[PDB]
């Protein structure tokens, strides 16, 4: 699982 | 105005001999990579900007460019395995580990996030992040007397990254690394934040998904009672990982399963086996099937908690996958149980749903069901009540299904069905 930092 | 730059302009700014122009271009890149609609990760990689960002990570005298490059690299590493590999190939792992010690909380948080994405790629990058020495500084970030003093999002990101360091198999995380991380995980498992608890349970579920030696490592820390407490939580994001962990623990030894039973886990299964979420029901029935495969006193604990009627209910009506797990639980129950326990199972009304499930199109369920039939028939023989059971199976239409299974593709299916027809219905 990866997470993109949108804000 | 760092909004909507072109990759060409970003390259121009980053290639300038001006730290501030580089900072502005790096921020523009970050904003480009932080757009929900198709971030141009591949275009940024092809421009050769990863080594520049990695070098910016080390500019201690310009913390803003450190933060912007860390954010940009975090989003690049969030993509495909090839894109995460591109980030790792630039030397980002040691640079991010160094940033973990930054006096700016938001920069260290970004480094934690980035390392989480890299470790989350798979076992190889997970172990490489560990080899570069990330666990020590990561755990040092949590070395405070009370975790409530730390910012919520900060603690959540740290927990998520640690969970990714416990994740993935073939191979599993190094034993020494697991022992290093487990005490902090236990502490996070008692924090009041729902997301921290969910990710801590997910980490424990990863660590318990393995051989009994791994399960024993977790169970020795005394986290089973807390897992059961969280199993009774209202937040589904917490119950799901807690049930997976408890289910992973009961796949081990009968003593580890007993530690789960002693914590009071069975008292929660009335609600789990009727949970409106199909996956909770399936996972709970799978846990029950692994509990009914234990000792006879453990089957008796299942009986005393009134869970046999709930297994009958799940076998009568549920998602087919849950019904399969229930059939497994019944076959394990009948294989290890006493005649009295198998008699109680029949008295609870298992025969009719067991029969109705023999019309399925899954060979495995039919084998499982037919093996449970054999075990119940053996118990009837021991009691001299084979005729009674025969009449019962005939009254609910099971005989027709078994006779029709004598003409079935699978051999084990027609041999067992034909052995039953010849031994008890002739």
From Swiss-Prot, chain B:
Gene Ontology BP, a term: postsynapse to nucleus signaling pathway
Domain of life: Eukaryota
Positions of the UniProt region annotated as NLS binding site (minor): 244-332
GO molecular function: DNA-binding transcription factor binding; nuclear import signal receptor activity
GO cellular component terms, A-Z: cytoplasmic stress granule; cytosol; glutamatergic synapse; host cell; NLS-dependent protein nuclear import complex; nucleoplasm; postsynaptic density
Entry PTM: Ubiquitinated. Deubiquitinated by USP22; leading to stabilization and increased activity.
Localization (cell): Cytoplasm; Nucleus
Tissues expressing the protein: Slightly detected in brain but not in cerebellum and skeletal muscle, highly expressed in testis and spleen.
Major localization class: cytoplasm
Keywords in alphabetical order: Acetylation, Cytoplasm, Nucleus, Phosphoprotein, Protein transport, Repeat, Transport, Ubl conjugation
Family the entry assigns: Belongs to the importin alpha family.
Function: Functions in nuclear protein import as an adapter protein for nuclear receptor KPNB1. Binds specifically and directly to substrates containing either a simple or bipartite NLS motif. Docking of the importin/substrate complex to the nuclear pore complex (NPC) is mediated by KPNB1 through binding to nucleoporin FxFG repeats and the complex is subsequently translocated through the pore by an energy requiring, Ran-dependent mechanism.
Comment, domains: Consists of an N-terminal hydrophilic region, a hydrophobic central region composed of 10 repeats, and a short hydrophilic C-terminus. The N-terminal hydrophilic region contains the importin beta binding domain (IBB domain), which is sufficient for binding importin beta and essential for nuclear protein import.
Name of this protein: Importin subunit alpha-1
């Amino acid at each position: 699982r990866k997470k993109t930092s949108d804000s | 105005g760092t909004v909507n730059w072109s990759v060409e302009d970003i390259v121009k700014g980053i290639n300038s001999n001006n730290l501030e122009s580089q900072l502005q271009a790096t921020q523009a890149a970050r904003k480009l990579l932080s757009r929900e609609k198709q971030p141009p990760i591949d275009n940024i990689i092809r421009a050769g900007l990863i080594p520049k960002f990695v070098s910016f990570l080390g500019k201690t005298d310009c913390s803003p460019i450190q933060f912007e490059s860390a954010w940009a690299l975090t989003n690049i590493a969030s993509g495909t395995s090839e894109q995460t590999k591109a980030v790792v190939d630039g030397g980002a792992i040691p640079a991010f580990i160094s940033l973990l010690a930054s006096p700016h909380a938001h920069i260290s948080e970004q480094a934690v996030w980035a390392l989480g994405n890299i470790a989350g790629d798979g076992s190889a990058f997970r172990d490489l992040v560990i080899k570069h020495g990330a666990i020590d500084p990561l755990l040092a970030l949590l070395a405070v007397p009370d975790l409530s003093t730390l910012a919520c999002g900060y603690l959540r990101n740290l927990t998520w990254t640690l969970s990714n360091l416990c994740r993935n198999k073939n191979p599993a995380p190094p034993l020494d690394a697991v022992e290093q991380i487990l005490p902090t995980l236990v502490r996070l498992l008692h924090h009041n934040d729902p997301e921290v608890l969910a990710d801590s349970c997910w980490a424990i579920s990863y660590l318990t998904d393995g051989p009994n030696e791994r399960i024993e490592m977790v169970v020795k820390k005394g986290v089973v009672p807390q897992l059961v407490k969280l199993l009774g939580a209202t937040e589904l994001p917490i119950v799901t990982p807690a049930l997976r962990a408890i289910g992973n623990i009961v796949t081990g030894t009968d003593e580890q399963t007993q530690k789960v039973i002693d914590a009071g886990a069975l008292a929660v299964f009335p609600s789990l086996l009727t949970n409106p979420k199909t996956n909770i029901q399936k996972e709970a029935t799978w846990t029950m099937s692994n509990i009914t495969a234990g000792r006879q006193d453990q089957i008796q604990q299942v009986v005393n908690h009134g869970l046999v009627p709930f297994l009958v209910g799940v076998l009568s009506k549920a998602d087919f996958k849950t019904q399969k797990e229930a059939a497994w639980a019944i076959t394990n129950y009948t294989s290890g149980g006493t005649v009295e326990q198998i008699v109680y199972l029949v008295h609870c009304g298992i025969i009719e749903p067991l029969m109705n499930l023999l019309s399925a199109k899954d060979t495995k369920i039919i084998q499982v069901i037919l093996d449970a039939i054999s075990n119940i028939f053996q118990a009837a023989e021991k009691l001299g009540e084979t005729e009674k059971l025969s009449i019962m199976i005939e009254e609910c239409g099971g005989l027709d299904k078994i006779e029709a299974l004598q003409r079935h593709e699978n051999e084990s299916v027609y041999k067992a069905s034909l052995n039953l027809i010849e031994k008890y219905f002739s």
